[PDB]
Design a protein around this ligand. Sequence first.
Ligand SMILES: NC(=O)c1ccc[n+]([C@@H]2O[C@H](COP(=O)([O-])OP(=O)(O)OC[C@H]3O[C@@H](n4cnc5c(N)ncnc54)[C@H](OP(=O)(O)O)[C@@H]3O)[C@@H](O)[C@H]2O)c1
Ligand SMILES: NC(=O)c1ccc[n+]([C@@H]2O[C@H](COP(=O)([O-])OP(=O)(O)OC[C@H]3O[C@@H](n4cnc5c(N)ncnc54)[C@H](OP(=O)(O)O)[C@@H]3O)[C@@H](O)[C@H]2O)c1
Ligand SMILES: NC(=O)c1ccc[n+]([C@@H]2O[C@H](COP(=O)([O-])OP(=O)(O)OC[C@H]3O[C@@H](n4cnc5c(N)ncnc54)[C@H](OP(=O)(O)O)[C@@H]3O)[C@@H](O)[C@H]2O)c1
Ligand SMILES: NC(=O)c1ccc[n+]([C@@H]2O[C@H](COP(=O)([O-])OP(=O)(O)OC[C@H]3O[C@@H](n4cnc5c(N)ncnc54)[C@H](OP(=O)(O)O)[C@@H]3O)[C@@H](O)[C@H]2O)c1
Ligand SMILES: Nc1nc2c(ncn2[C@@H]2O[C@H](COP(=O)(O)OP(=O)(O)O[C@H]3O[C@H](CO)[C@@H](F)[C@H](O)[C@@H]3O)[C@@H](O)[C@H]2O)c(=O)[nH]1
Ligand SMILES: Nc1nc2c(ncn2[C@@H]2O[C@H](COP(=O)(O)OP(=O)(O)O[C@H]3O[C@H](CO)[C@@H](F)[C@H](O)[C@@H]3O)[C@@H](O)[C@H]2O)c(=O)[nH]1
Ligand SMILES: Nc1nc2c(ncn2[C@@H]2O[C@H](COP(=O)(O)OP(=O)(O)O[C@H]3O[C@H](CO)[C@@H](F)[C@H](O)[C@@H]3O)[C@@H](O)[C@H]2O)c(=O)[nH]1
Ligand SMILES: Nc1nc2c(ncn2[C@@H]2O[C@H](COP(=O)(O)OP(=O)(O)O[C@H]3O[C@H](CO)[C@@H](F)[C@H](O)[C@@H]3O)[C@@H](O)[C@H]2O)c(=O)[nH]1
Lengths: 341, 342, 341, 341
Amino acid sequence: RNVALITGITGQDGSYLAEFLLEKGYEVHGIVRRSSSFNTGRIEHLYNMKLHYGDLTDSTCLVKIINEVKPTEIYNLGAQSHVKISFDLAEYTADVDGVGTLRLLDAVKTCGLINSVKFYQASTSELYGKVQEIPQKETTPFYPRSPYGAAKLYAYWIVVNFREAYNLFAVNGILFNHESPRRGANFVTRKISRSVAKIYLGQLECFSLGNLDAKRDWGHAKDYVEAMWLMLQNDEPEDFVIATGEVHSVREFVEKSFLHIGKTIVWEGKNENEVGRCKETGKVHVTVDLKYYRPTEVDFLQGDCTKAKQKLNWKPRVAFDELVREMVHADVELMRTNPNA
Amino acid sequence: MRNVALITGITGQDGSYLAEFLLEKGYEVHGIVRRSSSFNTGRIEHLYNMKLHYGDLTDSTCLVKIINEVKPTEIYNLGAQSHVKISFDLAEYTADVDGVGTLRLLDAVKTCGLINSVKFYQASTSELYGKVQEIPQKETTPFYPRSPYGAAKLYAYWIVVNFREAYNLFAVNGILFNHESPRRGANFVTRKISRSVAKIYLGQLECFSLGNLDAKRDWGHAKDYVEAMWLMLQNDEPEDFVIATGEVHSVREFVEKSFLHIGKTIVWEGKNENEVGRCKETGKVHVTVDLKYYRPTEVDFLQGDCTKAKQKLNWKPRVAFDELVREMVHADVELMRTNPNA
Amino acid sequence: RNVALITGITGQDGSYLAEFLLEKGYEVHGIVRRSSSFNTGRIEHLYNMKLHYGDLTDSTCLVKIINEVKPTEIYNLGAQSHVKISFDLAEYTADVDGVGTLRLLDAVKTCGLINSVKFYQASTSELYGKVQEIPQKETTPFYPRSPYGAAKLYAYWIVVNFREAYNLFAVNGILFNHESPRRGANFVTRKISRSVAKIYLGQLECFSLGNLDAKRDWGHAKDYVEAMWLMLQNDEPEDFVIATGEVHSVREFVEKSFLHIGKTIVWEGKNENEVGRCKETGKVHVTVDLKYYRPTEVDFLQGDCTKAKQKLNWKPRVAFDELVREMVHADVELMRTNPNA
Amino acid sequence: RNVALITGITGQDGSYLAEFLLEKGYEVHGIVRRSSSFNTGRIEHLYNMKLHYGDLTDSTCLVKIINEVKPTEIYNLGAQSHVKISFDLAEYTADVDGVGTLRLLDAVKTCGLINSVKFYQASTSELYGKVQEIPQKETTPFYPRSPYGAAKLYAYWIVVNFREAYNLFAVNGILFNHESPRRGANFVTRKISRSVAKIYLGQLECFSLGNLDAKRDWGHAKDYVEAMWLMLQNDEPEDFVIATGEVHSVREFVEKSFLHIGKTIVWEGKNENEVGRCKETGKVHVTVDLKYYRPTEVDFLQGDCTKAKQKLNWKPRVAFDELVREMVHADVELMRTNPNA
Ligand SMILES: NC(=O)c1ccc[n+]([C@@H]2O[C@H](COP(=O)([O-])OP(=O)(O)OC[C@H]3O[C@@H](n4cnc5c(N)ncnc54)[C@H](OP(=O)(O)O)[C@@H]3O)[C@@H](O)[C@H]2O)c1
Ligand SMILES: NC(=O)c1ccc[n+]([C@@H]2O[C@H](COP(=O)([O-])OP(=O)(O)OC[C@H]3O[C@@H](n4cnc5c(N)ncnc54)[C@H](OP(=O)(O)O)[C@@H]3O)[C@@H](O)[C@H]2O)c1
Ligand SMILES: NC(=O)c1ccc[n+]([C@@H]2O[C@H](COP(=O)([O-])OP(=O)(O)OC[C@H]3O[C@@H](n4cnc5c(N)ncnc54)[C@H](OP(=O)(O)O)[C@@H]3O)[C@@H](O)[C@H]2O)c1
Ligand SMILES: NC(=O)c1ccc[n+]([C@@H]2O[C@H](COP(=O)([O-])OP(=O)(O)OC[C@H]3O[C@@H](n4cnc5c(N)ncnc54)[C@H](OP(=O)(O)O)[C@@H]3O)[C@@H](O)[C@H]2O)c1
Ligand SMILES: Nc1nc2c(ncn2[C@@H]2O[C@H](COP(=O)(O)OP(=O)(O)O[C@H]3O[C@H](CO)[C@@H](F)[C@H](O)[C@@H]3O)[C@@H](O)[C@H]2O)c(=O)[nH]1
Ligand SMILES: Nc1nc2c(ncn2[C@@H]2O[C@H](COP(=O)(O)OP(=O)(O)O[C@H]3O[C@H](CO)[C@@H](F)[C@H](O)[C@@H]3O)[C@@H](O)[C@H]2O)c(=O)[nH]1
Ligand SMILES: Nc1nc2c(ncn2[C@@H]2O[C@H](COP(=O)(O)OP(=O)(O)O[C@H]3O[C@H](CO)[C@@H](F)[C@H](O)[C@@H]3O)[C@@H](O)[C@H]2O)c(=O)[nH]1
Ligand SMILES: Nc1nc2c(ncn2[C@@H]2O[C@H](COP(=O)(O)OP(=O)(O)O[C@H]3O[C@H](CO)[C@@H](F)[C@H](O)[C@@H]3O)[C@@H](O)[C@H]2O)c(=O)[nH]1
C-alpha cells in the first residue's frame, strides 16, 4: 500500500514528484487551491491521481482530506515560496509556510496516523541566509534573511519537535535552489531563460534584473524530487542537505543563457548602471533596476550534501551548464509555439 | 479631478470587466492580485493607468499598506472564494475570505483615516436569499442562506451596513443576481455547458455530466452588471440595490438553448441520476447526471426584482438570456477552435 | 450515556449550566482558556466535571477534545460577548463568535458524530438589533447593529445550514438579556449593582453610565440555562426565543437598585448633562459620559416566547424586581467581605 | 516624550514593568484582553496608565492602537507563555507568540514609526531547549523542544529581520526563568510556594508534581524588567542573555520552600512512586504524577550574562534562596488573609 499526499502539487516540485511517484505505482493525492482561473497547467497531462480542493490555512479541509486518504507518505511542498514577495506578504507567508506545516502535522496526529505516516517537509537553503559556514551542511547554524526564511525556520523546528515528541517519522529536506522548464516565471533563472528566448525570437529587445552578483548552488527539480522520496525510504528519519556543491552567479546564468542563442554578453558600468551588451551586434539586452533587490539579500549559498551521498546514495545528474541549456531550449520552443507567455 | 479605484478580485470575471469600464472613464485603477505558482492574470493581461499589488484578503497588514499607499476614492470588494459547491469543502477559508475579509477592508479604510473620502462597494449576492422567502426577491426580502458561501456573504452584507450606520462610511451592498460571460469560471454551470457544447461541436468531446438540471436562475451579463456597481457609487446617498433581469430559466433550458446554437435539439429521457439528454437529430447521448455535482442544500429558485435600481439608478440590463447563451457558445467555439487545450 | 461539552464554561451561563447538568448526573466537560491569572472563579466550587485547555480559534484543540470526550450534547456558549468592546475588537469577535461556531460544527462532522451529537448554539436577541417587529419572535427579520451582532448572525445561519445539510440536531437559542450575581462587571446591570453596593458601603460616591433610555427584556441566567437543556431534549431540532416579555429601561434599573439601599434617585438635566441625585441627601450618584454610548445603539428589545411556552413548557421564574434585589444584595455582601472584589 | 506600549501588561512581567516605567514618568499604555472575569489583578493598584482592549491575533486592533498611541517604546510581553499547555494549544501558541510578534512589527512599519520606535521582544532561554552549550550565551545555537519554543524562535528571527531590513531599533531579551509573588500559579515555583503556604495554614495536606530533577536558572521578575528597559536605552540595538548563572533543581525548590514553614522533606521511592514526607511529623506532602511531565523535556538551563554585565551594567539583586523565601512568605500572607486567593 503506497499512497502519497502532496501539498503544493500544482507547483514545480509537486508536478515532478507526482510523475515520479505515479511511475512507481503510487496512488497520488494532491491538494489544489480554488482559483478563478485554470491553475493545474503543470499536471493536466496526468489526468492513480486524485485532486482535492484545500488550503494550508483551513484546518478542517486538511483533517478531512488526510482522514479520507489515509496516506502512507505526506510531502508538504505547499508554500508562498517567493522570497521577494514575502517582504510584502509577511503575515500570509507566516500562516501558510510556518503555521500551515503545524496544521498538517497536527492533522496527522488527530487522524491517528502518527505511527504509520512518513512526513517530508520542504525545508530550504534560505534557512542559512547570511551564511555562518561555507559550505553549508546539516550542522551549519541557521540565519534567516526574509519573512519566508523565518517562516520556514518555524516549520523546520516544529517538524523536529513532532519527531522527537511523538516519534513521527518526519524529515526536513534542506534543499538548495532547484530549477526546471516549469520554474515560476518570476524566479531569476526562468525570468532569464524566458527573456533570452523572447530576444532570440524578436519578441523582446531588453530586460532588467536586480542583483547580478548573487551566487547560488543551482540544480534540477527533477533530480531533487527523487531525494525527497529517498529520505522517506530511509530506515531512520533524518534531515539532509540536497545540493550540487557548485556555485555560480546570476551574471553567469545570464552569460551562459545568451551563449545558447549565439550571443556573447559583455558587461559595462557598475551597480544600477551596469548593462549587458551583445558583442556581436552592439545591442543592450540586460539592465539593472534597484526595485528587484531585496532589503536583506542572501549573497551566497553553497551546499555540502556529503551526508546524503553516503546514506541515501543520491547524486545530482544535471549540472549547471545542462540546466541552462534545457531551460533556454524549452522556452524557445514554448515562445515559438505561443508568443503569449 | 481625482478618480482612483481599488479593486479586490481584479483577476476574476467581474474585476476584469470593471477594470476596463473604469479605465475607459480615465480612472487610475489599482488591483489586488494573489501570488500564484502559475500565471493568473489572463483576464486582464491585455490592459498592461492600471497598477497591480500583491495581497490577500486574509492578510490584514497588506490591505492597510495598499489602501494607505493608494488612497483610493472608490473601493470595489469583488475578491472572494465565489464557488458555492466548493464552499461546502472549504467552509472556514470561505468564511475568512468572504466574511472576515470584508471587515478587514472596511477597518483598513477606517484605520487609514479615509472614512469620509472613500466610497465602498461590496459584492453582495442573490445567494443571500437562498431558500427564497418571497418571489420575486427585492431589497426587503428576508435572507435565508443555504451554504457556507451564503452565510459568509451574509456576514459581509451586515458588517458593511454597520460601517455605514456607525461611522457614516459611504458603503453599499450590490445584491447582484447570477451574471455570466465568456470569461466566467469554467466550473460554474453556464460556462461548463458552453465549453462542453463547443467541444462537442468541434469533435473534441462526446458527452458531459451535470448535477441538478431543475435549478432555476435569473441570468444576466457581467459586463452590464459592473456598470451597476459604478452607478451605486455615483449615487448621492449610499443605498443597497438588487441588480437582476427578472427573467427565470432552468439549467435544463440553458443546456437546450446552448445545443440549438450548434444545430442540435436535446430531448430528455429518464429521471433523477439516470436522466440523459439525447440529440434528436442523431440519436447520440450528450448529457448525463452525476450526484456528485449536487449541493447538500440546494438553492432551487432565484428571480430578482430590480425596480428600485430602475427608478433610482436608471439601470436596465441590455443582454437577455437568449443572447447570453449565444455569445457564450459562439465565444467558446472560437476559443476551442484556435486552441483545443483551452 | 449523558456527556456534555460546554464551551464558555467559565462565563455566567456556562457556570449555571454546569451546575444544572451535574445535578442531573451528567459527565460535564468544559473548554477553558489559558490565562496568566486565575479565571475559574465561577466554577471552582464544582471541582463528574473535567476541564480542558482550548480556544475557539484553535481548530486542532477542538477536534482533539471532541474526539476524546465524544459528547452527547455540545453547548457552544464561548464568545467575546460584550457589544461595546466588539466595536474595537471587530475581527477577533468575528473569528471567535462567527468562525468559531463553524469550527465546532466541523469538528463534530470530522469526528463522525453528526448523527449522535445534539448541538446548542448561543444565539441572541442582538440579532434583532434595530427591531423590525415588536415584540420579537422566531420569525422576526434580523437587523444586527454591531460587529458582535453580525458575527452572531453568521453563527446562527451556519448552524441552520449544518442542520439542513447533514441532519445534525442543531438549534439556536435566541435568548434575550439574562443577568445574575455572576454577570460580567462591565455589563450595565452588574455595573449598576456593584456601584450601588460600593456607594452603600462608602467605597464610592458617584459613577457614570451611557444611554439611560435603552430598554431591555431582562431575565435570570439560572432560568435561561434550563431552556437550553430543554431545547436539546426536544424530539425535533427547533429554534426558540427565550425571554420574559417585560421591558424596563436602564434608568429604571438604576432607580430600583438605589431603592434597595434606601435612596430615591431623582433625575435632572438632559442627555450627557443628565445626573441622578439622591432625594434624601441631595448628593449626585449617577452621571452620563458619551464614551459609554455605542456608535449604533440597540434601543429596544422585547421577546415573545410563546413558542417555547407551548412546545418546551418553559416559563421564567425570576422577574425583574427580584433580579434587581438579588444582584444588589449579593454585591453588598461581596464588597463588604472584600472591598477589592 | 516617553510613551510605552506594553503587550502582556496584565501578566507577571508587564505588571512590574508598568510600575518601573511609571516611576520614571512614562505615559504607559497596555493592551488587555477581553475576559468574562476580572483579569487586571496585578495592575489594579496603578489606576499616566491607559488600558486598551486588544488581542495579538487581531491585526487591525494592533494598528489602531499603535497609530493612536504613537509609542516611543514597545515591549512585546504578550504570549501564551506556558510550555506544557503549548503542546495542547500548538496552533494558538504559534499565532500569538510567533505571528503576533510580526503583526506588531508590521504595524510599526505601516504607521510610519520605523525610525522613532524602540522595540523589545520577550525572547527566552526556552530557545536553547536541548542545550547545545553549557552555560548558554548569545551565540549558543538554538534547539527548541516545544511548540512554545518553536513559536518564540520565529519571533526572535522576525525581530532580527526587521532590524536588519529596515533599521528598526529592535532587540531580543533572551531572559532565563524569572519568578515572583505574582508568578502564574501553574508554573512550578509558584505552584510549590502556594501549596506549601496552604499546607502551613491547614488548607491542604498534599500536592503532586512532575519531573523533580529538572534544573533551572531562576531569578526575580522585578530585577529582569529593568534589563528590558536598559536594552532599549542602549545606543545600538543588541540582543542580551539575562540570567543568574546559578542552577537548582525543582526538588531543591520543594526542600527549601518547606524549610521556610519548619518542615524537612525526606524522599522515598522512585519515579512516579516517589513521595516527599515531613521528617518531623511523618506526614506525606508531595507525590509525583506523570501527567505533569512534558513529551520533550528541557532538562537543564544555565545562562551566561557576561555581555549584559559588561554593556548594560546589569546584575541580578535577588538570589535563589531569597526568591524562595519571598515567595513562600508572600503566599502565606495571601492565603491567610483570603483562603480562596
Ligand atoms: N525550488 C527551490 O529552489 C526550492 C528550494 C528549497 C525549498 N523550496 C520549497 O519547496 C517547495 C516546492 O517549491 P516549488 O518551487 O515547487 O514552489 P512553487 O512552484 O512556488 O509551488 C508552490 C506550491 O504551493 C502551493 N500553495 C501556495 N500557497 C498555498 C496555500 N495557502 N495552501 C495550499 N497550497 C499552497 C502553490 O499553489 P498555487 O499553484 O495555487 O500557487 C503551489 O502548488 C516550496 O515549499 C518551496 O518554498 C523550494
Ligand atoms: N458572478 C455572479 O453571479 C455573482 C453574483 C453575486 C455576487 N458575486 C460575487 O461577486 C464577486 C465577483 O464574482 P466573479 O464571478 O468575478 O468571481 P471570480 O471570477 O471567482 O473572482 C474571484 C476573485 O476574487 C479573488 N480572490 C479569491 N480569494 C482571494 C483572497 N483570499 N484574497 C484576495 N483575492 C481573492 C480571485 O483571485 P484568483 O483569480 O487568484 O482566484 C478573483 O480575482 C465575488 O465576490 C462573488 O462572490 C458573484
Ligand atoms: N448574557 C446574555 O444576556 C446573552 C444573551 C444571548 C446570548 N448570549 C451569548 O450567550 C453566551 C453566554 O453568555 P455569558 O453572559 O455567559 O457570556 P460571558 O460571561 O462573557 O462568557 C463567555 C465565555 O466564553 C469564553 N470565551 C471567550 N473567548 C473564547 C475563545 N476565544 N475560545 C474559547 N472560549 C472563549 C469565555 O472565557 P473567559 O472566561 O476566559 O473570557 C467565557 O467562558 C455567549 O456566547 C453570549 O454571547 C448572552
Ligand atoms: N517568566 C519567564 O521566566 C519568561 C522568560 C522568558 C520569556 N518569557 C516571556 O516573557 C513574557 C512575559 O512573561 P510573563 O511571565 O509575564 O507571562 P505571563 O504572566 O503568562 O503573561 C502573559 C501576558 O500575555 C498576555 N496574552 C496572552 N495571550 C495574549 C493575546 N492573544 N493577546 C494579547 N495578550 C495576550 C496575557 O494576558 P492574560 O492575562 O489575559 O492571559 C498576559 O498579560 C512572555 O512573552 C513569556 O513567554 C517569560
Ligand atoms: N527573482 C529574481 N531574483 C533576482 C533578480 N535579479 C537578481 N536576483 C537575485 O537572484 C537570486 C535568486 O533569486 P530567486 O531565483 O528569486 O530565488 P531565491 O533564492 O530568492 O528563492 C528560491 O530559492 C530558495 C532556496 O534558497 C527557495 F527557498 C525559495 O523558495 C525559492 O525557490 C537572489 O539573490 C536575487 O536577489 C530578478 O530580477 N528576480
Ligand atoms: N457549478 C455547477 N452547478 C451545477 C451543475 N449541474 C447543475 N448545477 C446547478 O446549477 C445552479 C447554478 O450553479 P452555479 O452556476 O455554480 O452558480 P451558483 O448559483 O451556485 O453561484 C453563483 O451565483 C451566485 C448568485 O446567486 C453567486 F453569488 C456565486 O458567487 C456564483 O457566482 C445550481 O443550482 C447548481 O446546483 C454542475 O455541473 N456545476
Ligand atoms: N455595558 C454598558 N451598557 C450601558 C451603559 N450605560 C448604558 N448602557 C446601555 O445598556 C444596554 C445594555 O447593555 P449591556 O448590559 O452591555 O448589554 P447588551 O444588551 O449590549 O448585550 C448583552 O445582551 C445581549 C442580548 O441582546 C447579548 F447578546 C450580549 O452578549 C450581552 O450579554 C445598552 O443599550 C447599552 O448602551 C454602561 O455604562 N455600560
Ligand atoms: N509547571 C510545572 N512544571 C513542573 C512540574 N513538576 C515539575 N516541573 C518541571 O519544572 C520545570 C519548570 O517548569 P515551569 O515552571 O512550567 O517553567 P518552564 O521552564 O517550563 O517555562 C517558563 O520559563 C521559560 C524559560 O525557560 C519561559 F520561556 C516560559 O514562558 C515560562 O515562564 C520543567 O522542567 C517542568 O517539567 C509541575 O507540576 N508543573
